[PDB]
Symmetry: C4
Subunit: 321 residues, 4 copies
């Protein structure tokens, strides 16, 4: 036994679980609970069937992640989920052993996180497994899919998640008129969903225009959004490799944001929180192959909605992701 062999036929069309973890863990008063800015945790449930004490053994499972990466992306390693639990990384820690009380059917594995300076360009995943052994007073679920957890970790701040891209247009700069003003395409490419990734508490990034997570060249196109306020204020839009991708902000108006709430009609305990970013206006060059330059004009409004179920008073736990 020990080794299962199969042809690239793996149920790894499924397998990654999305887990949302606050970038910073704090109390209702806003003081840091896990040691500061970018320090957080996540209580991961472990279910147990059957009247004695059970010690559950949990371990890093780089193997399942490797199978999943090859099954999902083959040769395109630039798109692989990156192993957050790899040797030497200091993003995540967890106990290798968990005790379950005699008559309890659950236990919580406390995952600790240090998201400081994480580059969310890497599709960071924490792969875990329930360890099986003859010594142990238990068995990992026969359905290997249940005894394994491939966790796509998303830190979140007040401004991150999957924004609607409905208010953003993407036009191609065709040339320049007599006045030097850009000639642009009439038609627009609309990205219905734009993922806003955490950098720190007041900063996210998006990929430039139509670029997204499934682009092997992603990392060349990160656009930073810094929120210069808590619930309203200006936004600083920047690009660390501006010169490379010919990044240019429109200097006429400065972008701004506002956070606002609305009650649900059906469930009046459910609150819709919105992050609205106005006057996003920038230009950049997308380079599919060397010598081919497609200059895009990205412009409009970004809107993020977050549903808060107030039947949970933790706020960090109340989110309906």
């Amino acid at each position: 036994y020990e080794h299962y062999i199969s042809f690239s036929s793996q149920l790894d069309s499924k397998g990654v679980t999305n887990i949302y973890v606050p970038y910073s863990r704090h109390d209702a008063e806003g003081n840091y609970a896990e040691g500061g800015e970018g320090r957080s945790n996540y209580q991961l449930p472990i279910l147990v069937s059957g009247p004695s004490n059970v010690t559950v053994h949990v371990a890093h499972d780089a193997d399942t992640l490797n199978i999943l990466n090859y099954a999902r992306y083959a040769t395109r390693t630039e798109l692989y989920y990156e192993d957050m639990g790899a040797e030497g990384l200091a993003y995540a820690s967890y106990p290798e052993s968990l005790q379950i009380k005699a008559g309890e059917n659950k236990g919580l594995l406390d995952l600790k996180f240090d998201f400081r300076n994480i580059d969310m360009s890497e599709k960071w995943v924490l792969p875990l497994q329930i360890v099986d052994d003859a010594s142990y007073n238990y068995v990992a679920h026969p359905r290997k899919d249940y005894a394994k957890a491939i966790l796509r970790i998303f830190p979140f701040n007040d401004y991150s998640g999957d924004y609607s891209g409905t208010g953003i247009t993407n036009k191609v700069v065709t040339g320049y008129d007599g006045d030097g003003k850009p000639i642009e395409t009439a038609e627009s490419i609309t990205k219905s969903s734009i993922r806003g990734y955490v950098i720190d508490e007041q900063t996210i990034f998006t990929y430039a225009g139509i670029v997204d997570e499934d682009y092997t060249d992603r990392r060349k196109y990160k656009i930073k959004f810094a929120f210069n306020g808590e619930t309203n204020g200006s936004v600083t839009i920047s690009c660390d490799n501006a010169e490379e991708i010919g990044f240019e902000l429109n200097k006429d108006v400065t972008p701004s944001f506002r956070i606002s709430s609305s009650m649900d009609d059906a469930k009046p305990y459910l609150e819709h929180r919105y992050v609205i970013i106005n006057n996003v206006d920038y230009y950049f060059n997308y380079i599919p192959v060397e010598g081919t330059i497609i200059r895009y004009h990205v412009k409009g409004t970004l809107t993020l909605s977050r549903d808060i179920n107030t039947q949970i008073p933790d706020e960090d736990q109340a989110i309906e992701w």
Copy 2:
């Protein structure tokens, strides 16, 4: 073995079976068969494969219910299915052992019930399992899903079930005019389905307006409906915590009900029985969070349809739930 361990990945997205049991078991002449009002029974089939006598062992399965509750509702314990078979409860009884005749492929487990004063606010469930042992001349089905029964028990009287909410409007009281009459919202929130839960033979309850079973604060919003007749008459609408939720009945008209029948076009042996409740008119305060008061005006008609297949003459068994 003995213990199966898994991450919150459980097929417990499925698992609860809805079982309809008459609140009172009686004969065609209407006399009580199980000891009186609120005393009833349910014959639960047990299937057997393979020419000897089989003794099937059945036991309470609080473990599977616990896994299902945590998998389905996590921390929101106010929404958990409550264990009807727990130590000391006198709602349900059943034999712990059932005999199957030599050449029979079925047996019936006779569940006995005492629904007197049951609070249907608790999502009462009876969790059972086929017990496996080396001593036994059988094996519980390998598909654990088949050897386990999580039964959501619904007592039923002539007036209970899932009513259509199509004829009920829910408007918000915005203020009061010069005459003191309420100013209400024009638009309405329509609950397409309103569950009518049994209290006794002539009484049900619904949750107030838009409140339903998935509200953690349900129990604060029970509206009682008492049928003052057998097949027609008035209805007494009340609320035991009226002062807390600012419950107010409209005193202009008194609500009434009527039971009526119609034959199906396709299957002329199928009878559609209707319970129509007219002139439901009341007000109450929904409190999502302390200090937030949303005063609703609930008004209209409730209609319950029940399909009776007359190719079964038991009437209590003839219902196509």
Copy 3:
């Protein structure tokens, strides 16, 4: 082991395989191949994985049929699939043992049939299983669903199958006018599919009007159709219990049939054969409960389509059922 126990949770929502067998087995010249009228056969494939000779043991499986009947119809025994392979029946025979040649992956189990005087009102099924034993140089497929065959046997003649009911109207006789002529409902109940069951080579039956296979009282409503020709001619419509159900034929026109062909547009090797029955005109009383009489007027055209794939020259085997 030997006995699997489960609660009425069985995949027996599936399980019955429909098998079409010619009522009479004959050659291209129309001479009887299996001993005469109503004598037939069916070659049932048995698949084998893995270089030696395999003897497959097949047996009657009344157990699986019993589980399926209780799981599907519970107490309504009038709707059960009837066991064609039961002790003493002379409808079907088959070898209890089948040899598979050394390098072959298939074998054919020759089922022999005697359909003479079969009452298709009984939903006749032949239940079979691959027998497992330690002595045997094989194992019945782990998926019990694959090692078991619940065969709904349909004999077929030139005029049987599922007719379209689109051209048949079902109206209710409301009363009689001054001239004694019936007053009928304007609206009609349309049965989109009407099953024509074999009686013999030139006779089928349908259930009366809206009655079908899922009526517990089916047997009281059989309408016989006798084809008085090979490819055209009159039809004799009768009812053996005419007096009981107040059966009455309209004497104005005599019903007739015609068989006709058409080539498919897409697959020109595919032939659409049609059986058209015109001027079906009769009356009968449906009795849901004693004292309730619903007099129906059934009238119109019946059309049966049968697709013959001429890339099979057996004709009896060429049908795309």
Copy 4:
């Protein structure tokens, strides 16, 4: 054990994997990498779970192909997938043993191919299995579906694949007018998809008009398309059995092709390559049964689209099949 027995109930409604292999393997400079014209290869991934060296044993699996052929086509052997790995064939070779490095979760089985003079009329398949043994330091995946690979091999050249049939009409020649010109049906039969099979680097074949892969008489209707250029030029349309099927080309205009590109709107790294064949104009006789002749007029444009993901620079590997 060794033999699994089942009734024609096999998940072989699924099972065949389509694999696209270049007819000729060559480098970016267009020089032959595998020995010349029609010589190619395919690197087939093999996935391994669990820290030692694993030797995987792979073997020809004619058994699974046989089960699949009987389950899918029964008696119609003219439609069976043909065994490319059968004794004496020189189309494919592969190692019977593959080594996996200590900490690797994948290995690549190098399939070598010689497609010279392959007749794609045969639905050539290469059936393989992971071999299981007690000696081996591994186990073939319990899901037999994962430990088995039934590979429908498609060689491809610049002009092959599934063409759109939208621009091709199929009309029936009804007779001839006074001038001898054909009288044709107004309505057309449109094949939405037309498969272009490889013959060599500059030649494909299609089946004549409406004939396709699921015709038992396919082989009588092969229409050859020879591309007399690299990216544009004329096309030579011929039929090796022209006299048998009364094949006739319209001599008025000569067919031609052109290869052209377009960038995707959404993914600008994705290139849509098109092969457009204009002025396809020919006649042939389809013979469903002897004595029945249906003369078709096939005319129009063929368009093949191929998506090239330039985030892969191998070009032969960049195709999104």
